[PDB]
Swiss-Prot record:
The keyword Transmembrane helix appears for this protein: no
Alphabetical UniProt keywords: Aminotransferase, Transferase
The enzyme's E.C. designation: 2.1.2.10
The family this protein is said to belong to: Belongs to the GcvT family.
MF (Gene Ontology): aminomethyltransferase activity; transaminase activity
Subunit note: The glycine cleavage system is composed of four proteins: P, T, L and H.
Lineage: Bacteria, Pseudomonadati, Pseudomonadota, Gammaproteobacteria, Enterobacterales
GO cellular component: cytosol; glycine cleavage complex
Alphabetized Gene3D superfamilies for the sequence: Aminomethyltransferase beta-barrel domains, Aminomethyltransferase fragment, Probable tRNA modification gtpase trme, domain 1
PANTHER family: AMINOMETHYLTRANSFERASE, AMINOMETHYLTRANSFERASE, MITOCHONDRIAL
Organism: Escherichia coli (strain K12)
Record's protein name: Aminomethyltransferase
């Protein structure tokens, strides 16, 4: 149970189960919550996330072996990156954000659904490197997102905290007293994620409401992230799916070739052979694209292919249905899905739809 539970109820939360946590689906209007993030500021309780602190002189070394992105690229203190964590078959165990603070101190953030699997795996592979693993269940976290999010949050910062984040670029995190403030998010907008002691969380939440930040629930969390082309573990990938087939190729640090990491050789073979690809689908016709719907097309050579929707939704920003889908190579400009017992052509696009309050160029 989140430390924010009482504040959620006071904010009119309609609760659902989220991987064992009672969490707000919305607070009266998931559509308004979505539009708040796109145009002003909304916030999400992400205390269901697990923050894992890693300590030890070999921490960077460990993570260069654990992760498929390369934390050697984190050279400025506080810098973060996004990475897959792969099994030996090159499938995805999870995705995550990792922060570098010092050579003796990095931090990972992972989801509730995969927490115990990840912890077991991290623990197992950490042992020979002598890494001390500390789970930060003493911290809650709030994501404040939207074009006015940083400004509104910053009204609550003290002078030292303002100074710490002044000019801070994306994908950095910094500790300033009780607040860990990071320029991260799951929305396609600017914002912060802010971690702080459980016992401080409720008051900080209330202060943020007063600062003009709208409480936003899981429903908007999902429409926002899918519009932004951001993956959801279990849907866009899982242990059976290569990152190359989940639009995560860009996160694979192939060079330097001499960096060993788990999944490396399987991944190299997958790259050599080719994989399926994650694309976007747009359906302007009335109806909603659903998870697991088949996607059919014929390639130029006449081979009939079937992919699958990984995540679908009705886009509040665009006003029509969108989806991420995993499809065989060779797809064209359109494909077919079944809607109301009939074939429905859909437009095939890049796996991203909205960033910074606006439809991406291919959609306007």
């Amino acid at each position: 149970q989140t430390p924010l539970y009482e504040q959620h109820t006071l904010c009119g939360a309609r609760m659902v189960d989220f991987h064992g946590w009672m969490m707000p689906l919305h607070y009266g209007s998931q559509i308004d919550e979505h539009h708040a993030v796109r145009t002003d500021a909304g916030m999400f309780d992400v205390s269901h996330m697990t923050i894992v602190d890693l300590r030890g002189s070999r921490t960077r070394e460990f993570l260069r072996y654990l992760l498929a992105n390369d934390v050697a690229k984190l050279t400025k203190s506080g810098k973060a990156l996004y990475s897959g964590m792969l099994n030996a078959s090159g499938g995805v165990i999870d995705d995550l954000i990792v922060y570098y603070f010092t050579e003796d101190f990095f931090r990972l953030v992972v989801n509730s659904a995969t927490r115990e699997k990840d912890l077991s795996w991290i623990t197992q592979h950490a042992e020979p490197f002598g890494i001390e693993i500390t789970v930060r269940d003493d911290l809650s976290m709030i994501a404040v997102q939207g074009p006015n999010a940083q400004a509104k949050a910053a009204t609550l910062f003290n002078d030292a905290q303002r100074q710490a984040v002044e000019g801070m670029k994306p994908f950095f995190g910094v500790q300033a007293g009780d607040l860990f403030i990071a320029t991260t998010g799951y929305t396609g907008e600017a914002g912060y994620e802010i971690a702080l002691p459980n016992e401080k969380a409720a008051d900080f939440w209330r202060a943020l409401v007063e600062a003009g930040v709208k409480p936003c629930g899981l429903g908007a969390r999902d429409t926002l992230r899918l519009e932004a082309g951001m993956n959801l573990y279990g849907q866009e990938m899982d242990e059976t799916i290569s990152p190359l087939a989940a639009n995560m190729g860009w996160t694979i640090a192939w060079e330097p070739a001499d960096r060993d990491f788990i999944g490396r050789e399987a991944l190299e073979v997958q790259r050599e052979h080719g994989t399926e690809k994650l694309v976007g689908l747009v359906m302007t016709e009335k109806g909603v694209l659903r998870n697991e719907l088949p996607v059919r097309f014929t390639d130029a050579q006449g081979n009939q292919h079937e992919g699958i929707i990984t995540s679908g939704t009705f886009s509040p920003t665009l006003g029509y249905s969108i989806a991420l889908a995993r499809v065989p190579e060779g797809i064209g400009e359109t494909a077919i899905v079944q809607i109301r017992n009939r074939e429905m052509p859909v437009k095939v696009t890049k796996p991203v739809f909205v960033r910074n309050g606006k439809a991406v160029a291919g959609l306007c």
